[PDB]
Amino acid sequence: DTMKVINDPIHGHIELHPLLVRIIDTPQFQRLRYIKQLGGGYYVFPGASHNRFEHSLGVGYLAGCLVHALGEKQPELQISERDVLCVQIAGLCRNLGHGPFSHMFDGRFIPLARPEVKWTHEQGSVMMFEHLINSNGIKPVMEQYGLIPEEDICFIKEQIVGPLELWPYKGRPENKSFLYEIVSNKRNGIDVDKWDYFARDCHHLGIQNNFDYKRFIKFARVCEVDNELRICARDKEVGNLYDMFHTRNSLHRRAYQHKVGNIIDTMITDAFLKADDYIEITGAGGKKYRISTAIDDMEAYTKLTDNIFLEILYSTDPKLKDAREILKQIEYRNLFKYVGETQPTGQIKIKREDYESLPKEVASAKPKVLLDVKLKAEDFIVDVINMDYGMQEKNPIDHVSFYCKTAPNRAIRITKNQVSQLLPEKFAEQLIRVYCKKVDRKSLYAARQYFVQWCADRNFTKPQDGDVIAPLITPQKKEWN
Amino acid sequence: DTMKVINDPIHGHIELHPLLVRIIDTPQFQRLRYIKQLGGGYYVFPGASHNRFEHSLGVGYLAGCLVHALGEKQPELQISERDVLCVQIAGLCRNLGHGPFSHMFDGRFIPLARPEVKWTHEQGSVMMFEHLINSNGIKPVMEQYGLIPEEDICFIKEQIVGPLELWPYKGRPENKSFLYEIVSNKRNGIDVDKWDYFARDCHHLGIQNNFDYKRFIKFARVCEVDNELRICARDKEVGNLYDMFHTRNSLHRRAYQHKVGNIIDTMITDAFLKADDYIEITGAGGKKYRISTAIDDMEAYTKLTDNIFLEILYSTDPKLKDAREILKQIEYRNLFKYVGETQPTGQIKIKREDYESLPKEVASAKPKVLLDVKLKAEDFIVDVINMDYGMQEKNPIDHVSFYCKTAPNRAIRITKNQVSQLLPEKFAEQLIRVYCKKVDRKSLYAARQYFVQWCADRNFTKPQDGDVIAPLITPQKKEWN
Amino acid sequence: DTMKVINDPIHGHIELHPLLVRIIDTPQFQRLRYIKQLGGGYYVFPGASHNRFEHSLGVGYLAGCLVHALGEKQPELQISERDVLCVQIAGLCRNLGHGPFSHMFDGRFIPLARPEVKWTHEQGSVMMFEHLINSNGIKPVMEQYGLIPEEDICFIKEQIVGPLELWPYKGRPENKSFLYEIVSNKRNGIDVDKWDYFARDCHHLGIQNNFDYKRFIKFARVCEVDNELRICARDKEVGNLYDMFHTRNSLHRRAYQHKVGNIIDTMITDAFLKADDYIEITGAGGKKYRISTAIDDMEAYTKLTDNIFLEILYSTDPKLKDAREILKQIEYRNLFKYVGETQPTGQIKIKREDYESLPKEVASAKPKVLLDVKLKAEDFIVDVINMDYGMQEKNPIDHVSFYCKTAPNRAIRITKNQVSQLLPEKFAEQLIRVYCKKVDRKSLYAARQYFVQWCADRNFTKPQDGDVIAPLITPQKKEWN
Amino acid sequence: DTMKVINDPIHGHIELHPLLVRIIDTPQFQRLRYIKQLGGGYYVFPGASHNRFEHSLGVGYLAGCLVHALGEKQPELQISERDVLCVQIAGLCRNLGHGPFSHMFDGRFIPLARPEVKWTHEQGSVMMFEHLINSNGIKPVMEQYGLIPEEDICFIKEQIVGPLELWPYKGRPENKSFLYEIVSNKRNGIDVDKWDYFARDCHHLGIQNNFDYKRFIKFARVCEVDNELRICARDKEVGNLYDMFHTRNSLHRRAYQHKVGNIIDTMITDAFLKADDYIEITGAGGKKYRISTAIDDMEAYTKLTDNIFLEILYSTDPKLKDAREILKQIEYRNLFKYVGETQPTGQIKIKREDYESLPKEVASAKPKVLLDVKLKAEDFIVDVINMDYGMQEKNPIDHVSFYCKTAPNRAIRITKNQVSQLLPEKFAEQLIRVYCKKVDRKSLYAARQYFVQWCADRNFTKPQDGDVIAPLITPQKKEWN
């Protein structure tokens, strides 16, 4: 009937139009209350107990903020209330597709359990959105508030995942192009989703966010770039933009890719793999689904949350023992041991199809050290992490358009060399982490010897503690000394 | 085994002694990750996703800080490393006894499901602590780090629950009396648990804390009080102490007793009550327990967490339908409708044995106004809330000892009239919230009529919106104008 | 001449219309950079380095926020861009009249240097506003942006000071009465000026503000209260409002009325008094003024800031010696010693005319103890402090209009007992601080004896440290023991 | 003479040993209350009202924190209470040398006024410190607390300015080498002074700090390196350390070197030059000094603060006409107009001896464009800014020693390529800002043509707005297209 205000620790009092309220008060949306934003990160950062629900509320709020700001500052854009509401709904709903422990599910679990499939949290979000609309009678409420369900549901979906397939969009015409740069910016990655998680994740982790989104919004404009309307930033702000991405990198280095967080996500993925044949999830029309197939039926996926973890933990079934055990070793803090980190040298790169051959390589290394144990390939875990500014090797700032103070409607480009000599020369790199499943003293020592020798063989960078953990090995490599 | 550092958003970097680490990494302790601090409050304040785990870490840390401060400022107290460790353990382990959704369980569920039982989260914390120790072989680790298990375990439990059985404590003699004022203050309720939940709940709820625990600790001393050594505060701080309780009251007014938060706790409690016969929880041996009898076997209670919500939510069994449905309504935001709040006048209390009878009274009122429907007692929920300063009718500051700059070893008392004329004249009051389970507009109108007629009948305070919700009744009461 | 944006630590990025900018970039306004918000409080709280300038920007910002909110919510109020700019301007300029060290000047120095006159900071702000406008050619700029300066300048001045003197305002008609409730609220004291200083002062003091003005703004409406259009709060906000004033009180108890801060403001006031004959302030036509007479000429007052403090401190003129030495003592932290605090009892009220006679009364005590040295009226400082909720003995909440969810246009009233029984009985009280200019040990012992006896004879409250600093005098009362 | 507690918004309740209080409560130290930390920054960031005084308290506090942490974790270092006091004093007093508006004085004014001398705020701090010591009789107090003034005064000065000229320090022997890395780190610039200004400047500016000093402290140790005990950081903190210097750089980009802030500092500097002949500051033996010579007499320097600005602004002296006017043009916000920024390309670098020639080069540029007027050399201001990681062209992390989990007492080194490929390739650069003193539109258009052309001739980087403010010049340069 009427609008609701919600108090958020990050954004303060957020105003929710009744349509948005109808959307969030559904099993499909409330589901996000039971999915950790950072998953295994909670087991390293105890403040990171926040869930995808609150983050979703924040994203919808900020999307509303940005579209409103653009509207008030440039009434010649013809932004309407329909537009604002659709942008807000896309903002609210672009996290609907995340599975248990967030990045754990689409990052590790699904690629292993369903490698024949190409699955993304985006597509999950489109499917869940469809299922929410259809299961909850949302369309007549949309029509009741001035929306046109065909066009606008199309628009929302396109905001979430991109062209559902010349102007490639059917949800909105060319003159409203800029609207697709708010929720998920596929042009340069600068969107309100990032802003919310910067602020929220920082608030919960105990790290401080250094990026000011309100300032960005206040300096944002729509300008014409190559016969298309885009969101441009003031020239002055280029530095801030670089810093924004630097911040993202920082957050990944400190929190999101923390080695123990990662190994915990790994162990949970392993347990889920071992439980997949024995856990059942009741989907549409009584049908039974498993963890790995819940994504085929949205009624089932609706009921796939962090809960499973606990179901495996509290299970009495013998067939779940293995699974139940791995989780139990997480509770006792008996985790796989971190052996080290290294990087490839030069423009050398490691391709994904080769990842699987890596633990065999490590165990196949021959350190000239006397060892009482010999470890095998399956005693090693090798996590390959690609760190980049969101556009592979590309500088995302090269894909931002700027406007100057004398001519607010004339878009310009700014090159890196126009800003600072202290900026990165590369915008992508790989980090290689090696762990050992054997956790006792001797096994760990051996694992370090194998690891450093393997780094030396592949001409990788010298591990930071190399001289300490493998003093009989590091002198061999002239390039290291 | 060496110490570990944990980054907490509230307290920053927290140092954990290896014995504490050993205690934390148990299923009995890690269980607290799956119990929300404010339970139903999360469904009103989406920032409040925090659990009992992180709060527990905070309490342990704060206990450590206070004891260390006391020790270093006053070396004559013979505070030992053993003492510091035991106080830290007490702080860490005093939330182990909480149930699903915390307050909902000891405050609402257990009293209704087992009226004869006398359950407290303190007792549960003691039992769960015993269970942790004996299940994880902590005793030898304790003696490895210099504790004597038989005395120090007693000390810890006494810190949590009070005297198990003229000096009543067996863990420490009178000259260490002050040590029992740190983790759970039975004398005046000024303890580190409060400080942690003020800061933490405020950080998560998005409402802000005005109390400064660090200042308090800075000015904390131990002084002789009536044969005992007791923690005393600098005189100047008296105003800050009253304010502390004020803050507590405030936090209860805005968040913990939010009418809607409370009604959701109520709906969940009702759902658990209707699910109690059908949810089985395996304990020691394989003996099955219920949600309501889990508190009799710690191996089962270890597995009793917020998960039971989702269990009930995800169930399919017809026997669970009623319990499932309720939860589902919560998801759809079909909550019982708030009719209004009122208070009794004079020295007139609603005893507790009188609670159940209240809904009958509301339905028995005669509002001489045409009604589309008649309402019965089962259509009403009457929630009676006791707001106080933690010592019933008493003023806890009267039970605080102070010291002065000129003679910092002399305990004194400070009265209310010595502080301010603007303090509360009373320290305990009752709030009466009335809800109607019937949600339609007719039923709700009627419910407002019954409610205001009821308030008039027993000379309760006029509902704030009385003249607007029931204009045909309020004029019958001349003291309401 | 475009909009400017200023980054504020409290409110983030504030937008400033070119008219506001033009007003701000004048010496009359920039003057505020050189006056401390809390004056001598900076000498107790090193974080309180903030000046009236930033506070002013904040007040203007918040005034804009509130008008914009009201207008966007209720378009039928006919709030014009003109109204918005005028409210903003009044927000910006209502601190123009503050003197050196703010409160020190109008509340201590001026009433002692010019006892004949009634000077307030409001009046100073209207005169300074007039001077700013007239000396900077603002009127045609006001006209350039659609203002009509006769009635609009009248309106701004009225917002600052009240009716210039049935509807007494000439700037805006009765139907816009609510506009007068934003910058300086004469009805209940709830205005945006308070909100800014709560947040700003807390930010700098190292104390946290627990009041949420954004929430209040979000719940504010305009309703008809006795043929008058007035700002009204949502009913359930009532608690927060009590808390608002509570916070004000605590802020005064913890910082603004800090005893050492007050004694430092007293010593500075004294030094200014001893320098008043010798300092020359140049005004219009080259006429010279003193510190106490600069208020008579806005050109001179424009150059009357905290600068004076240093001019005295750095001076070599022997005429200034006395003054100078006082300040030097402050630098050496040789302050008058704090003797103690006490309050009147029953229905006793310390009248202002009596304030002068109190040092004699104290010195005219007769304790009956050993005494080395006798003290005189000269040696004593008696500071009487009036602590209230902004309306003397009245409850400001009784002068707030509320509205209920069910009928947002229908304004109602709410009594204290409709809220809580833990709220204050009285809403005004007096505090009595005694200091001694003789700082040695024997003299201080003396002063303490004198003081306690004086509390006994005038039936005052026993000072908190009574039993320790004067154990030979406390048993003589009765109601103290 | 007891210990004091000060509430600081950044660090909370800081405690101060009475010797520290003795040093603090002097005109020499208290003088810092009247010198703004960021100077002209206040005129761009209104939150930046904070002074050198509170910063100094912060630095002393942090210095004590770090030396205490090291001592507590590593007893074998034999850190004495006396060491702690000396480090706290050095931390407290290392800002004594600062002049009016801080950086404005030592970075701009003195270089222009006194080109024949080499002045630094460090040298000034040592001088001011000696003056403080001698003027306030602190040597006997130092002795009262177990300090040995001959050794310890030298030690403190050495911490402030370096060796007063194998082991070149007289204050402490090699085995206390680490003690010189706390207050002013000449080895790599990682010190507690930076930490405090990071946190404090961020708190006041309204931009957020992402560096965690507490974390660094928790992970710091002392290890042997090249025959001396130095402060080593844990290996895994290397990223954080790089980020520390990024933060610093960022703070300079956004705030400290804000183009308007810098131009305001430049105008104030010019005013001071034009006022230097006429302002008198009386020092020792009533001897008068100029602003430019006050550094030659500590008694005079003690009275050289921000006050001078006001002294110039409030003057009536005809001789101070030209100075006063300039400051007045600051108040009316008639500042020099920012023409633009550029950088040198490649290895090319501008030596300071050439700075004065830069305005000439710009006016002597020949843009092939129509100019309505013609600008000369003195119509241009050219500001050259060196941005570095504090060690000119060197990577400071290459001068950081690290330690590993597995061998805490073994010091190691970590190279840039062992950390990341996304780090800076360069560690110093130059920014060149150009402003125009003539503010009219024609002059300014011309100034842009001149500036851009100058950039082209010098092979400088293209100004970010080049294609807009100078459409005719920019497409003539090949290196830009």
Ligand SMILES: Nc1ncnc2c1ncn2[C@H]1C[C@H](O)[C@@H](COP(=O)(O)OP(=O)(O)OP(=O)(O)O)O1
């Ligand atoms: N006193 C408070 N201070 C700050 N936040 C609050 C306070 N009370 C409630 N909140 C939060 C909780 C919610 O997230 C959000 C809105 O709740 P609330 O204002 O109480 O609406 P409501 O639905 O409970 O009442 P109603 O339906 O009668 O308007 O604000």
Ligand SMILES: Nc1ncnc2c1ncn2[C@H]1C[C@H](O)[C@@H](COP(=O)(O)OP(=O)(O)OP(=O)(O)O)O1
């Ligand atoms: N860069 C960071 N900044 C702030 N907090 C961090 C950072 N990295 C990790 N944390 C947090 C997460 C943990 O709660 C706590 C400890 O993490 P960490 O220092 O990495 O210990 P660790 O156990 O992973 O490594 P190790 O065993 O080698 O000491 O600090």
Ligand SMILES: Nc1ncnc2c1ncn2[C@H]1C[C@H](O)[C@@H](COP(=O)(O)OP(=O)(O)OP(=O)(O)O)O1
């Ligand atoms: N990177 C930044 N982050 C946060 N605040 C900033 C930043 N840069 C400047 N500010 C602040 C300082 C001012 O208070 C306010 C406006 O400064 P700024 O955006 O630089 O406008 P400006 O007047 O200096 O340039 P212009 O006239 O070209 O717009 O924002």
Ligand SMILES: Nc1ncnc2c1ncn2[C@H]1C[C@H](O)[C@@H](COP(=O)(O)OP(=O)(O)OP(=O)(O)O)O1
């Ligand atoms: N209630 C308060 N809350 C927070 N900070 C406070 C409060 N009162 C004072 N402060 C601050 C101001 C000072 O910087 C610091 C110390 O003040 P305070 O404790 O009152 O010492 P004091 O010197 O005035 O009294 P005393 O000498 O009797 O101990 O704490």
Ligand SMILES: [Mg+2]
């Ligand atoms: Mg408690």
Ligand SMILES: [Mg+2]
């Ligand atoms: Mg501007």
Ligand SMILES: [Mg+2]
């Ligand atoms: Mg006021």
Ligand SMILES: [Mg+2]
């Ligand atoms: Mg330095």
